[PDB]
């Protein structure tokens, strides 16, 4: 993509297009779909320890940002463009999992209900690190609790996965640029 011509496209977005339009390896697309469907299943049943053990690499960065609304023509104002809703290493994810599982987490009773919808899976091996798998996918995440609370989250995920212990592919980076600037879901206390 020529971002001088395609005026609305970011350099970052153009780089990611190129990664997937080049690759096609249909078996890889299928492996990636399985990986993500299984991950989502673990999360949906709130098997957060299982998720950490089976899906998350020790070197993970799990990052969700919220970008400040700036003028499309802005070129002078240079301060921090985004904040980190999540920017977690493995230990920080573990703290979050322990908080979920603590029997004095009052907000988890009655038990929450999660349903995740994973679509638009794309997969490409890294050019330089032959053991690093790039996976892109979109998620709709539905959270229901306490009779009449329903929150629906929508995001695109840019992942890196790498084979780890036992040859199991695990998440080493997830990046989400959350599309809604002001959240209307009470909080973003869900694993996208």
């Amino acid at each position: 993509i020529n971002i001088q011509e395609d005026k609305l496209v970011s350099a970052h977005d153009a780089e990611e297009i190129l990664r997937f339009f080049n690759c096609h390896d249909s078996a890889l697309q299928q492996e990636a779909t399985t990986l993500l469907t299984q991950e989502a299943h673990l999360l949906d049943i709130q098997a957060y320890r299982a998720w950490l053990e089976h899906c998350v690499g020790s070197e993970v960065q799990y990052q969700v940002i919220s970008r400040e609304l700036r003028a499309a023509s802005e070129r002078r104002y240079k301060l921090n463009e985004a904040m980190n809703v999540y920017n977690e290493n493995f230990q920080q994810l573990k703290v979050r999992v322990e908080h979920q599982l603590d029997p004095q987490n009052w907000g988890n009773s009655p038990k929450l209900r999660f349903t995740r919808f994973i679509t638009n899976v794309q997969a490409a091996m890294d050019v330089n690190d032959k053991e690093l798998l790039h996976i892109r996918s979109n998620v709709i995440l539905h959270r229901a609790r306490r009779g009449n609370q329903v929150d629906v989250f929508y995001a695109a995920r840019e992942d890196k996965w790498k084979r780890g212990e036992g040859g199991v592919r695990k998440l080493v980076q997830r990046f989400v640029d959350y599309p809604e600037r002001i959240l209307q879901t009470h909080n973003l206390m869900v694993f996208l």
Binding site: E68, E74, V95, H99
Partner: protein, 446 residues
């Protein structure tokens, strides 16, 4: 409802009618008597440092543009075109010499003045009095050590006087530390609570921490972690509570410089705070240098809250009686190493931001307490804030304001609500002052 006569808050601030968190007619009245009257947080110097830098901010339900002028001052204006009333600026921050309206193209300066009108000569000739068509300006804009507040009411006290006895507590961190920076952009989330629910919780509620935050205390390994599940009461002399004439108040937890931060940051922070305290002893005295590195949970009346040392800065932006838009910034000490500043900012959002696991613990508390204020059998019920009443002092030789010399109590609730009631029942600042001439006597009865 007759707000001149209706007792919404009882004498000494001991209770409040539950309807105050639910009643929409009262919410509309608060727009006039609370938000249009009092000082409201806008931004920090650090977010608009250069000429032409601007941000948008809410003041009550109104939106304003806050702009750094060429002479270094800051002016703020309604984000509303003077022609047909379109919103002028649709972004959160930027740099510009002016603002053009996308409806008919009117151009306003960074100073609010109407500078151009398309085809003025051909269309208006000489008939448009542009001098009278500048953006509606916020009457008062003042700074507290780089923190910029606005007030629509020209009659308000100066910001410093408005902070009252709270200012003394804030100065060690806000002034003597070398100053603070606000790290943006903020997290923004809507909660289904009245703005007063988080405001009251931050101003004065240490009692909830061990029970509400049991899981976050246990899981995060923060410095206050012994409190989990009410396993341990803070010891004797672990802190105090204060409040002030114009409603601002805070809790003080001695020495808790690492605050909510998880064990990953505790050693580094406790070293940094302790080192600065050692230098400050000589400059401001041992007590105030200790306050510098003590955790303050404060609300600057009405709707700006903070946790010093944790480095949390909040605005509870009102939407309606059961809806509030929560803005969450990090505050850092300017002279901290940049890498620590970065990690502190991330840790603030980790704990109390949009996916803040600590703040998540508070959601149901504030939402259901607010929503219950709409329920028929609860509207006329009394919310209680009597903990510690009869033990508060005023005019103490060491700690100013109305002070409860205990870490846990409801002193700051009482002062908050005393000020609230005085505003709601008054038509202007003069009437608030008359209603507040015995404010500390009222708070220290029995």
């Amino acid at each position: 409802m007759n707000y001149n006569n209706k007792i919404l808050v009882s004498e000494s601030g001991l209770s409040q009618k539950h309807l105050i968190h639910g009643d929409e007619e009262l919410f509309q009245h608060e727009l006039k008597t609370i938000f249009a009257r009092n000082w409201l947080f806008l931004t920090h110097d650090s977010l608009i440092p250069a000429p032409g830098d601007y941000v948008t901010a809410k003041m009550g339900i109104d939106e304003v543009i806050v702009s750094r002028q060429n002479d270094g001052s800051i002016r703020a204006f309604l984000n509303v075109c003077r022609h047909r009333g379109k919103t002028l600026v649709s972004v959160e921050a930027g740099n510009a010499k002016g603002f053009v309206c996308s409806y008919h193209g009117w151009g306003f300066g960074s100073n609010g003045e109407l500078q151009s009108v398309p085809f003025e000569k051909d269309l208006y000739g000489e008939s448009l009095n542009k001098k009278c068509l500048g953006l509606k300006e916020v009457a008062r804009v003042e700074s507290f050590h780089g923190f910029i507040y606005g007030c629509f009411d020209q009659e308000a006290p100066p910001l410093m006087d408005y902070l009252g006895d709270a200012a003394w507590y804030l100065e060690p961190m806000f002034k003597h530390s070398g100053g603070l920076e606000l790290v943006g952009p903020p997290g923004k989330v809507v909660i289904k609570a009245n703005w007063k629910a988080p405001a009251e919780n931050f101003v004065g509620d240490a009692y909830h921490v061990g029970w509400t935050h049991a899981s976050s205390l246990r899981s995060g390994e923060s410095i206050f972690s012994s409190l989990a599940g009410n396993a341990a009461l803070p010891p004797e002399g672990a802190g105090l509570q204060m409040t002030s004439k114009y409603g601002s108040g805070m809790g003080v937890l001695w020495d808790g410089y690492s605050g909510v931060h998880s064990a990953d940051l505790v050693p580094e922070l406790m070293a940094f705070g302790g080192a600065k305290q050692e230098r400050l002893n000589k400059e401001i005295g041992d007590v105030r240098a200790r306050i510098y590195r003590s955790h303050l949970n404060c609300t600057v009346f009405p709707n700006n809250s903070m946790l010093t040392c944790s480095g949390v800065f909040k605005v509870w932006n009102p939407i309606d009686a059961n809806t509030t838009e929560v803005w969450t910034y990090a505050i850092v000490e300017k002279d901290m190493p940049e890498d620590l500043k970065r990690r502190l900012a991330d840790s603030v959002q980790r704990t109390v931001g949009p996916a803040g696991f600590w703040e998540s613990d508070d959601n149901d508390n504030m939402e259901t307490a607010s929503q219950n204020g709409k329920k028929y059998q609860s509207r006329d019920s009394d919310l209680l804030s009597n903990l510690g009443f009869g033990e508060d002092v005023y005019g103490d030789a060491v700690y100013p304001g109305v002070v409860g010399k205990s870490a846990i109590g409801e002193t700051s609730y009482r002062g908050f609500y005393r000020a609230y009631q005085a505003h709601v029942s008054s038509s202007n600042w003069a009437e608030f002052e008359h209603a507040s001439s015995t404010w500390h006597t009222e708070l220290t009865k029995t």
